[PDB]
Design a binder for this molecule. Structure first.
Ligand code: DTP
Ligand code: CA
Ligand code: CA
Ligand code: FE
Length: 1107
DNA sequence: TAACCGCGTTC
DNA sequence: TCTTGAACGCGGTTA
C-alpha cells in the first residue's frame, strides 16, 4: 500500500542526492572500544551537518524508518549518512500490578504492525511521590516504520474511545485487559525530531560518522562554508492586474553565488542584449554581475537549472520566493515540458512551500516575519534593506516593469539585480548565522528552524530537556467545546495581562523647566534606605563587596545632600531629566524568580501561593434559557455537507447553539456579553522538577549574552574618535548586528511564557500566566508610586515607565575599588531595584542538594532589575480627543544629538495608513525640538501644521499630479479573501469588490490584498464605506473610468473625471485635523498654552474647560 | 452613546 | 496542519 509511494520517493530523492553530490557514505567496521576520547582512531569520515530528512530504506521488508544526514567534509566535498531508529510510543496503564497482562493483549492485538515490546520507566510529573523517586511504568511499543506506528494508533484509538464509554449490559444481577489502557503517550512526535532528541544530533555541529554512531568533534570551532545561492525573478505584468503563471512569462532571473553572481534574460521580451555591469550599493556588498542573455524562455529556465546543477548549492535563499518565485518557475517549467523535480530536485510540500532534499530553501521573508522585530509596515524588502543593510535599493514601479522590457531594458536589469544582492547579503549577514546557530540547540533542520512558530521552537527545546531528564511528555492540550461559569455559557476566558497607564501628555525638553511637587516623606523614606541600597548596588548589582570599594562614603554623602535639599525645597521649577526604566526580560525573570512552571501549580513550606486575575466573558442567559434554545434547534432541518441536528458534528451543534444564544439574550437583556474578573490563588510548589524554569533560565542567559554585547559596542562607539570614519563604521555595524541577535532571541524567549497558553501546548497553565502578569502589574505600580512621589511619571507600559525628574535629583555616580576600576551606579535605578528586592524576593526557592537521598536546600532568588536609558532631549506624548482620557502606546523621544530615539504606535510606522497623516507625522515630530520656550516651541510646530492645512484648504492645488496620487491614498490590507468577509461592511471590503468588478474576480483570488483607495464626496452624506474608490481606476481607459466612476458616485451623467473633484476634502480635512488636535493643540492646552493652530477648533468640552 | 470589529502595533 | 500571550488606538459600523 502507501508504502510504495514512500520507497519510490526515497529512491528518487537518493538519485537526486547522488547527482547533487550527496552519496550514502557507509563507514568502515570497527571492533574496538568506542569512546569520543579516542576520535582520531575510529574509522570514519568527519563532516559538518547541514540537513536532516526522514527517509525509508530497504534491507541495505516493508520499508525501514531512518534519517538521512547531509554533511560537508573538510576536503571540499559532500556526503550523506543514514541512521535507522525504530519509531516508538508508549502505552500507560491504570494499574501497575497488571502491566504484564496488557502486553499479552497488545502483542496479539497489534501482531499486524509491531516489531518489539518492552517495559520501561519514566518520571511522571503528575504522579504522587515522584520527587521521592517513584516512576510510572509504561509499555514501549516499537515499530519498523512510521506507517506501522500509525496503524497501531488506528487500532488503539477505538479501545481508548470504547474504554471511556460505559461497559455494556449483560447480566444486571451482578477486569477486561483492554479496559486497562489508560492512554497513549508520546505518539505525536515527528519522527526526525524523535531521532535528533534521542541521538543528540544537531545541524550545525561537527561529527565523525562511524560504525558505532555519530561522534561530535568538539575540537572544530567555526561552521563550514556552504555554497549559498540567492535568486530573484521578475515577470511580465498586464497593466493594473497581477502576475499569473498561466498567461505571464518570466522576464529575467537575477542571482548570486558566494559573492559572485549572474543575470539571465529572456531576450524574447528584453528588447536587446546586455553587457556585464556592477551594482555595489556600498563597499561591504560587492556585486560584479556577468550575464547569460538567452533566446527562448525555456532557454532561460534551462540555463538556471543547469547553473544550479553545476554549482551544487546547499542553501538557496529567496525573498518571499516560497509562494511567488518558486511556483512561478514551476508552472513555467511545466508549460514548457520541463519537470522541475527531475531538474533541480525541488518540489512543493504538504503546505505548498518549495523544498529540496540536499538544499535548504531560506525564504528571508519568513525570518523578517518572525525574527527581524520589524513592524509590518517596514517588512518589505525595500525597508528591510534600509534598516538592516544601511542603503537604499533601486525602486521601480511594477506597472513600468513589463513596459520597460522594451523601452529602458538596462534600467530594469539594474532593478532585478538590486533585489538579488539585497537578499543574498540579508541572508549571509542575518539569516544564515542566526538560523544555523539555532539548529545547534533545536532538533530541527534549517527549513524548519526558519519557518516554525516561536512557541513550537520553545516546545522543541523543552522536549529535549524533558527527555534528557527521563520526564514523560504530556500529551498536547485540548480546549473544551463548552465551558461554563455560574450557569452561563462562556464565550471567552483569560487572565488580566499587562498594566499600562497614560498619565500626562505634552512636550518635555531638557531645556524647558517644569514644576515638580516632591513628597517629603518619600525622600525621608529613601534616606532610611540608601545605606542598604548602595550596599545593594555593589553586592548584588555589580557582584562586588564594600570591603574593596573606596569612595563609598563620599558618594553616600553627595546623594544625601542633594536629597536633603529636595526635602526642604519640595516645590521647585527646574529643568527636567527625561528617563526610562525597564525591567530586563520581566516575565522570564518573574517566572524564574518564583519557580513558575505549568508543572508547579497544583491543589490539595513547599507552597508559595501567588494571586492572579481571571476574567471571563459569558452570556447572561441562564441554563434554563440555554436548554430552551437547544431543543428548539433540534427540531429544525439543516443542510448537509456531503439531516438532523443530532447528526451534525458536536462542534457544529455548538456553532449553531452560539448563534441562537447570541440573539436570544439580546432580546431579554440587550447585554450580550457580561465581563467579570475574579481574584484567584494558586499554589506554586517550590520543589517540583525544575526542567521548565531551567530551560527558560538558560535561554534568557543565552539572550542576555547578545544584549550585553550591544551595550558593550554602544560604549565602544562613545570612545570612537569622530575622525576615524572606518572605526565608527565597524562599531555601528556590530551594534546593528547585536541588537538584531538580541531581539531575534527576545521573541523566542518570551514565547516560553506564552507557550503556557498556546493551543495544543504540552505544558498548558492559565494559572501560571495570570500569576506572571499580576506580579508584573504589582511591581510596575510599586515603582510608579515612588516616582509619583518624587517626580512626574509621563507614561507606563507593563514593565517600563517614562518619567521626568528634577535636575537636582541624584543620577549617576562612580565608585572606585582597590583594583583601580570603576562601578556604574544610576541612583534612580538602584532606588527601585532595592525596593523590588525588599518586597518581591522569593525566600522559598528550593533545589535538590543531595539527589541520592532526595535532600533539598532553601535559598532566596530574585532576578528582577530595572535598567535606565537616558537622559533624553525631548519626549512628545499625544492626548485624546475625549475628556479625561489619555493615549497610551504612542509617543516620540529624541536623543541629545537631535536624532530620533523611539517612535511608538503612530501611523507613520504602522502598515498602510492614510499617507497624508503619515507624511504629516514624519514632518511634525522633528519640529518639536525647535523654539526657545514652551510657547515658542508650539509655535514652530504650529507653522508646519498650517502649511499642511493650506494643502487641504486649497483642495490640493499646490501639488503636481504625480505627487497628489501618493498623499491622499490609503493602502490597507485584507487578511483573508473577500468571500470570507460576507455580512461585513468596511472600506477595505468595498474597495476590494470594486477592484473586482472593474478588473475581474482574478484580483481578490488570493488573501493579503493591498487595497489602495480614495474617499469620494459622492453620494452625499452616504456612509464613508460606500464612497471608497480604488485608486487604480484613475489609470484605466476613459471609457472604463467614466462608467464605474458614475456607478460608484450614483451620478449617472457626470463628465468631470478629474481626480481632484471626486475627493472628499472635508473628510481628509477632518482626519488631518484630528491628528493636529491629538499631537499639537490639545497637548498644548493641558500644558497651559493657548491654541497654536486656531484653524483647528478645540472640542466643546475643552472650550468649556478653558472658561 | 456604548458595544463591537479588523488591523497592527506595544508591551 | 500548525498554532506564544494580553492591552491598546483608531476608523468605522451596529444596537
Ligand atoms: N512577543 C511577545 N510575546 C509574549 N510576551 C511579550 C512579547 N513581547 C513582550 N512581551 C511580554 C513579556 C515581557 O517580559 C513583557 C515586557 O516586554 P518588554 O519590556 O518589551 O521586553 P522584555 O522585558 O521581556 O525584554 P527587554 O530586556 O528587551 O526589555 O511583555
Ligand atoms: Ca523582486
Ligand atoms: Ca523590558
Ligand atoms: Fe509541594
Amino acid at each position: 500500500a502507501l508504502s510504495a509511494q514512500q520507497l519510490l520517493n526515497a529512491s528518487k530523492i537518493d538519485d537526486i542526492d547522488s547527482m547533487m553530490g550527496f552519496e550514502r557514505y557507509v563507514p568502515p567496521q570497527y571492533n574496538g572500544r568506542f569512546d569520543a576520547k579516542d576520535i582520531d582512531q575510529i574509522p570514519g569520515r568527519v563532516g559538518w551537518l547541514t540537513n536532516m530528512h526522514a527517509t525509508l530504506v530497504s534491507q541495505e521488508n516493508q520499508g525501514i524508518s531512518g534519517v538521512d544526514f547531509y554533511f560537508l567534509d573538510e576536503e571540499g566535498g559532500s556526503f550523506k549518512s543514514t541512521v535507522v531508529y525504530d519509531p516508538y510510543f508508549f502505552i500507560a496503564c491504570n494499574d501497575e500490578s497488571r502491566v504484564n497482562d496488557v502486553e499479552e493483549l497488545v502483542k496479539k492485538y497489534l501482531e499486524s504492525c509491531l516489531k518489539s515490546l518492552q517495559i520501561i520507566r519514566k518520571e511522571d510529573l503528575t504522579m504522587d511521590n515522584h520527587l521521592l523517586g517513584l516512576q510510572k511504568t509504561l509499555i514501549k511499543l516499537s515499530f519498523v516504520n512510521s506507517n506501522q506506528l500509525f496503524e497501531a494508533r488506528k487500532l488503539l484509538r477505538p479501545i481508548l474511545q470504547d474504554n471511556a464509554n460505559n461497559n455494556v449490559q449483560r447480566n444486571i444481577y451482578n477486569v477486561d485487559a483492554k479496559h486497562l489502557i489508560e492512554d497513549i503517550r508520546e505518539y505525536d512526535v515527528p519522527y526526525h525530531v524523535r531521532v535528533s532528541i534521542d541521538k543528540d544530533i544537531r545541524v550545525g555541529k561537527w561529527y565523525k560518522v562511524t560504525q558505532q554512531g555519530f561522534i561530535e568533534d568538539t575540537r572544530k570551532i567555526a561552521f563550514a562554508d556552504p555554497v549559498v545561492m540567492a535568486f530573484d525573478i521578475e515577470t511580465t505584468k498586464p497593466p493594473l492586474k497581477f502576475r499569473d503563471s498561466a498567461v505571464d512569462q518570466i522576464m529575467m532571473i537575477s542571482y548570486m553565488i558566494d559573492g559572485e553572481g549572474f543575470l539571465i534574460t529572456n531576450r524574447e521580451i528584453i528588447s536587446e542584449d546586455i553587457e556585464d555591469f556592477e551594482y555595489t550599493p556600498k563597499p561591504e556588498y560587492p556585486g560584479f554581475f556577468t550575464i547569460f542573455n538567452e533566446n527562448d524562455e525555456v532557454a532561460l529556465l534551462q540555463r538556471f537549472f543547469e547553473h544550479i546543477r553545476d554549482v551544487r548549492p546547499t542553501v538557496i535563499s529567496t525573498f518571499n520566493g516560497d509562494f511567488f518565485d518558486w511556483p512561478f518557475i514551476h508552472n513555467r517549467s511545466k508549460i514548457h515540458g520541463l519537470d522541475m523535480f527531475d531538474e533541480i530536485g525541488f518540489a512543493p510540500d504538504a503546505e505548498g512551500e518549495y523544498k529540496s532534499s540536499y538544499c535548504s530553501h531560506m525564504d528571508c521573508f519568513r525570518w523578517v516575519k518572525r525574527d527581524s522585530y520589524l513592524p509590518q509596515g517596514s517588512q518589505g524588502l525595500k525597508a528591510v534593506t534600509q534598516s538592516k543593510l544601511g542603503y537604499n535599493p533601486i525602486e521601480l514601479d511594477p506597472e513600468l516593469m513589463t513596459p520597460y522590457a522594451f523601452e529602458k531594458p538596462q534600467h530594469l536589469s539594474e532593478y532585478s539585480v538590486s533585489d538579488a544582492v539585497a537578499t543574498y547579503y540579508l541572508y549571509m549577514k542575518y539569516v544564515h548565522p542566526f538560523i544555523f546557530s539555532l539548529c545547534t540547540i533545536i532538533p530541527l533542520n534549517p527549513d524548519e528552524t526558519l519557518r516554525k512558530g516561536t512557541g513550537t521552537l520553545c516546545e522543541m527545546l523543552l522536549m529535549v530537556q524533558a527527555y534528557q531528564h527521563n520526564i514523560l511528555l504530556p500529551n498536547k492540550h485540548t480546549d473544551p467545546i463548552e465551558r461554563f461559569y455560574d450557569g452561563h455559557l462562556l464565550e471567552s476566558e483569560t487572565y488580566v495581562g499587562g498594566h499600562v497607564e497614560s498619565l500626562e501628555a505634552g512636550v518635555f525638553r531638557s531645556d524647558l523647566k517644569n514644576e515638580f511637587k516632591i513628597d517629603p516623606s518619600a525622600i525621608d523614606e529613601l534616606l532610611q534606605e540608601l545605606p542598604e541600597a548602595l550596599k545593594f548596588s555593589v553586592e548584588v548589582e555589580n557582584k562586588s563587596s564594600v570591603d574593596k570599594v573606596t569612595n563609598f562614603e563620599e558618594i553616600k554623602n553627595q546623594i544625601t545632600q542633594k536629597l536633603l535639599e529636595l526635602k526642604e525645597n519640595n516645590i521647585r521649577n527646574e529643568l527636567p531629566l527625561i528617563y526610562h526604566v525597564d525591567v530586563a526580560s520581566m516575565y522570564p525573570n518573574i517566572m524564574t524568580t518564583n519557580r513558575l512552571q505549568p508543572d508547579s501549580i497544583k491543589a490539595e513550606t513547599c507552597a508559595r501561593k501567588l494571586k492572579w486575575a481571571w476574567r471571563g466573558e459569558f452570556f447572561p442567559s441562564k441554563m434554563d434559557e440555554y436548554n430552551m434554545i437547544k431543543r428548539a434547534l433540534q427540531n429544525e432541518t439543516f443542510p448537509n455537507k456531503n439531516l438532523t441536528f443530532d447528526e451534525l458534528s458536536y462542534a457544529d451543534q455548538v456553532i449553531h447553539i452560539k448563534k441562537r444564544l447570541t440573539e436570544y439574550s439580546r432580546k431579554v437583556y440587550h447585554r450580550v456579553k457580561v465581563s467579570e474578573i475574579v481574584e484567584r490563588e494558586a499554589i506554586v510548589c517550590q520543589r517540583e522538577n525544575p526542567f521548565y524554569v531551567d530551560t527558560v533560565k538558560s535561554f534568557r542567559d543565552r539572550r542576555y549574552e547578545f544584549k550585553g554585547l550591544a551595550k558593550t559596542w554602544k560604549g565602544n562607539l562613545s570612545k570612537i574618535d569622530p575622525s576615524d570614519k572606518h572605526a565608527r563604521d565597524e562599531a555601528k555595524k556590530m551594534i546593528v548586528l547585536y541588537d538584531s541577535l538580541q531581539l531575534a532571541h527576545k521573541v523566542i524567549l518570551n514565547s516560553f511564557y506564552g507557550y503556557v497558553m498556546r493551543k495544543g501546548s504540552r505544558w498548558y497553565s492559565m494559572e501560571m500566566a495570570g500569576i506572571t502578569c499580576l506580579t508584573g502589574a504589582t511591581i510596575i505600580q510599586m515603582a510608579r508610586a515612588l516616582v509619583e512621589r518624587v517626580g512626574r511619571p509621563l507614561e507606563l507600559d507593563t514593565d517600563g515607565i517614562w518619567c521626568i525628574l528634577p535636575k537636582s535629583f541624584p543620577e549617576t555616580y562612580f565608585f572606585t575599588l582597590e583594583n583601580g576600576k570603576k562601578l556604574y551606579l544610576s541612583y534612580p535605578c538602584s532606588m527601585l531595584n532595592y525596593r523590588v528586592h525588599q518586597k518581591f524576593t522569593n525566600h522559598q526557592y528550593q533545589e535538590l542538594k543531595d539527589p541520592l537521598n532526595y535532600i533539598y536546600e532553601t535559598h532566596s532568588e530574585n532576578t528582577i532589575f530595572f535598567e535606565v536609558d537616558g537622559p533624553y532631549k525631548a519626549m512628545i506624548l499625544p492626548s485624546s480627543k475625549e475628556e479625561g482620557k489619555g493615549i497610551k502606546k504612542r509617543y516620540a523621544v529624541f536623543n541629545e544629538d537631535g536624532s530620533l530615539a523611539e517612535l511608538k504606535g503612530f501611523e507613520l510606522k504602522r502598515r498602510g495608513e492614510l499617507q497624508l497623516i503619515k507624511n504629516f507625522q514624519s514632518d511634525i515630530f522633528k519640529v518639536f525640538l525647535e523654539g526657545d520656550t514652551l510657547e515658542g516651541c508650539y509655535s514652530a510646530v504650529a507653522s508646519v501644521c498650517n502649511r499642511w492645512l493650506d494643502v487641504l484648504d486649497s483642495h490640493g492645488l499646490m501639488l503636481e499630479d504625480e505627487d497628489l496620487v501618493s498623499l491622499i491614498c490609503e493602502n490597507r490590507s485584507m487578511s483573508k479573501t473577500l468571500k470570507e468577509y460576507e455580512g461585513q461592511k468596511s472600506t477595505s471590503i468595498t474597495t476590494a469588490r470594486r477592484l473586482g468588478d472593474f478588473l475581474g474576480e482574478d484580483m481578490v483570488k488570493d488573501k493579503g490584498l493591498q487595497c489602495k483607495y480614495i474617499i469620494s464626496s459622492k453620494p452625499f452624506n452616504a456612509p464613508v464605506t460606500e464612497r471608497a474608490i480604488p485608486v487604480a481606476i484613475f489609470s484605466a481607459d476613459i471609457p472604463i473610468k467614466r462608467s464605474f466612476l458614475r456607478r460608484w458616485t450614483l451620478d449617472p451623467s457626470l463628465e468631470d473625471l478629474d481626480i481632484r473633484t471626486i475627493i472628499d476634502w472635508g473628510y481628509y480635512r477632518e482626519r488631518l485635523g484630528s491628528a493636529i488636535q491629538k499631537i499639537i493643540t490639545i497637548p498644548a492646552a493641558l500644558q497651559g498654552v493657548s491654541n497654536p493652530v486656531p484653524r483647528v477648533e478645540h472640542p466643546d468640552w475643552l472650550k468649556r474647560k478653558i472658561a
